[PDB]
Amino acid sequence: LGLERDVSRAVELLERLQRSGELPPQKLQALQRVLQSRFCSAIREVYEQLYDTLDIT
């Protein structure tokens, strides 16, 4: 689902820009916590888990 690749890429991309400090990083750091948060982790596991679930049943 390219979720780990897209999220992880969005997380580092937000940090990347955060390091640059060209635009308001406050919103970028907010996202970091929105995706990095343990919550989105469980949810993310769902997407990957669900796909597998499809292959099982």
Binding site: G2, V7, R9, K27, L31, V34, C40
Partner: protein
């Protein structure tokens, strides 16, 4: 979660200098990442939003 993400796209979108912003906008725009984020709001909303 989605709104915050979208908000960032707008900010980074206003900057045609950051190459990460471009690739970051794309990733944050695809409905896939939005779907997961959708789950974020669905639960959080039904958790303690009201």
């Amino acid at each position: 979660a989605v709104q915050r993400a979208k908000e960032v796209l707008e900010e980074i979108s206003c900057y045609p200098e950051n190459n990460d912003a471009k690739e970051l906008k794309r990733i944050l725009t695809q409905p896939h990442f939005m779907a997961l984020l959708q789950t974020h709001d669905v639960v959080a909303h039904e958790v303690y939003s009201d």
